[PDB]
Amino acid sequence: VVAAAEKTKTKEGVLYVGSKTKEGVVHGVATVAEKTKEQVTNVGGAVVTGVTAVAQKTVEGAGSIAAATGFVK
Amino acid sequence: VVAAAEKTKTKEGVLYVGSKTKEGVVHGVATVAEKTKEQVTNVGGAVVTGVTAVAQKTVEGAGSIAAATGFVK
Amino acid sequence: VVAAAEKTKTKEGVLYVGSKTKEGVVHGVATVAEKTKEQVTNVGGAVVTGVTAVAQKTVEGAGSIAAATGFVK
Amino acid sequence: VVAAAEKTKTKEGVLYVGSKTKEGVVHGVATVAEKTKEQVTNVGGAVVTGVTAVAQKTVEGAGSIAAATGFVK
Amino acid sequence: VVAAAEKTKTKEGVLYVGSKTKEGVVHGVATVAEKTKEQVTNVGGAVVTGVTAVAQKTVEGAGSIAAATGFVK
């Protein structure tokens, strides 16, 4: 499991957000197990969670994610 | 499982968002197991979750995701 | 599990956010196990969780995430 | 599990946030186990959790996360 | 488990935040075990938790996190 990223090197990249929420419940990244034997989970990269969510320009530079997720029996 | 990313190198990339929500519930990335034996899960890359979700220009630079997900018995 | 990142080297990158929420519950990253035997979890990279969430320009420089998640029996 | 990061080397990178919340509960990163045998968890990278969450320019420099998470029996 | 970071070398990097919250409960990073046998947890990198959370420019310099988390039986 190898990840390699290389980077070699007027409004730009500007965000305005206004949010009004009377009630918010946000769970993000969740793993829940009840009465479970084996649970293998991988979350990688960018997760944005919101009642309002904005992602801008998330990976302008090279980004690499490598995941091996699992079990051997 | 190998990921490689390489990058070699007027309004641009500008977002305006206004959001109003009286109630919001957002779950993002969730794995739930009840009474489960084996559960293998991989989430990779960018997940944006919102009552309002905006993704702009997510990977201008080279992005790589590699996933191997599973079990061997 | 190897990750390598290399970086070699008017409004830019500016965000305005206004948020009003009467009530907020946010869970971020959560792993919950009840009555569970084995639970293996990996969260990698950037997670932004909010009643309002903004991510801007998250990885301008090269970013690498490598994950191996799991069990061998 | 090896991570290597190398870096070699008008408003820029400016954020304004205003937030008003009458009530906030935020959980950040949480692992909860009740009546659980084995729970292996890894959280890596940047997690921002908020009733309002802003992440700007999180990794301009090269960032690497490597995780091996799990058990061998 | 090895991490190596190398760094070799008008408003820039400026944040304004105003927050008003009548009530706040924030949990940061929490591991809770009740009636649990084995619980192995690793939190790495930057976690910002807030009723209002702002992260700006978190790792301009090269940052590396390496984690091995788990048990061998």
PDB file of C-alpha atoms in Angstrom, chain A residues 9-47:
ATOM      1  CA  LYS A   9       6.666  24.320  -9.503  1.00  0.00           C
ATOM      2  CA  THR A  10      -8.502  39.418  -9.819  1.00  0.00           C
ATOM      3  CA  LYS A  11      -9.933  36.929  -7.363  1.00  0.00           C
ATOM      4  CA  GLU A  12      -8.569  33.386  -7.362  1.00  0.00           C
ATOM      5  CA  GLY A  13      -9.811  30.717  -4.967  1.00  0.00           C
ATOM      6  CA  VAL A  14     -12.246  32.862  -3.006  1.00  0.00           C
ATOM      7  CA  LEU A  15     -15.379  31.534  -1.239  1.00  0.00           C
ATOM      8  CA  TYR A  16     -18.170  33.352   0.545  1.00  0.00           C
ATOM      9  CA  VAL A  17     -20.616  31.256   2.577  1.00  0.00           C
ATOM     10  CA  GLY A  18     -23.494  32.409   4.734  1.00  0.00           C
ATOM     11  CA  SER A  19     -25.407  29.767   6.662  1.00  0.00           C
ATOM     12  CA  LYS A  20     -28.355  29.920   9.019  1.00  0.00           C
ATOM     13  CA  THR A  21     -29.725  26.751  10.576  1.00  0.00           C
ATOM     14  CA  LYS A  22     -32.107  26.614  13.466  1.00  0.00           C
ATOM     15  CA  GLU A  23     -31.116  23.005  14.299  1.00  0.00           C
ATOM     16  CA  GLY A  24     -28.172  20.941  13.072  1.00  0.00           C
ATOM     17  CA  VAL A  25     -27.056  17.368  13.757  1.00  0.00           C
ATOM     18  CA  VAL A  26     -24.007  16.259  11.735  1.00  0.00           C
ATOM     19  CA  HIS A  27     -22.318  12.847  11.984  1.00  0.00           C
ATOM     20  CA  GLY A  28     -19.014  13.247  10.072  1.00  0.00           C
ATOM     21  CA  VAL A  29     -17.409   9.878   9.606  1.00  0.00           C
ATOM     22  CA  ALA A  30     -18.945   7.160  11.739  1.00  0.00           C
ATOM     23  CA  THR A  31     -18.449   3.435  12.096  1.00  0.00           C
ATOM     24  CA  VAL A  32     -20.968   1.740  14.356  1.00  0.00           C
ATOM     25  CA  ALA A  33     -20.993  -1.898  15.294  1.00  0.00           C
ATOM     26  CA  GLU A  34     -23.567  -3.608  17.436  1.00  0.00           C
ATOM     27  CA  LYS A  35     -23.254  -7.337  18.071  1.00  0.00           C
ATOM     28  CA  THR A  36     -20.758  -7.600  15.254  1.00  0.00           C
ATOM     29  CA  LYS A  37     -17.798  -9.896  14.915  1.00  0.00           C
ATOM     30  CA  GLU A  38     -15.424  -8.334  12.434  1.00  0.00           C
ATOM     31  CA  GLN A  39     -15.663  -4.853  11.018  1.00  0.00           C
ATOM     32  CA  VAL A  40     -12.816  -3.425   9.043  1.00  0.00           C
ATOM     33  CA  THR A  41     -13.229   0.120   7.739  1.00  0.00           C
ATOM     34  CA  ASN A  42     -11.021   2.681   6.061  1.00  0.00           C
ATOM     35  CA  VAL A  43     -11.904   6.268   5.237  1.00  0.00           C
ATOM     36  CA  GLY A  44      -9.374   8.160   3.171  1.00  0.00           C
ATOM     37  CA  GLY A  45      -9.136  11.533   1.537  1.00  0.00           C
ATOM     38  CA  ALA A  46     -11.186  14.516   2.335  1.00  0.00           C
ATOM     39  CA  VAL A  47     -14.607  14.262   3.726  1.00  0.00           C
TER      40      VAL A  47
END
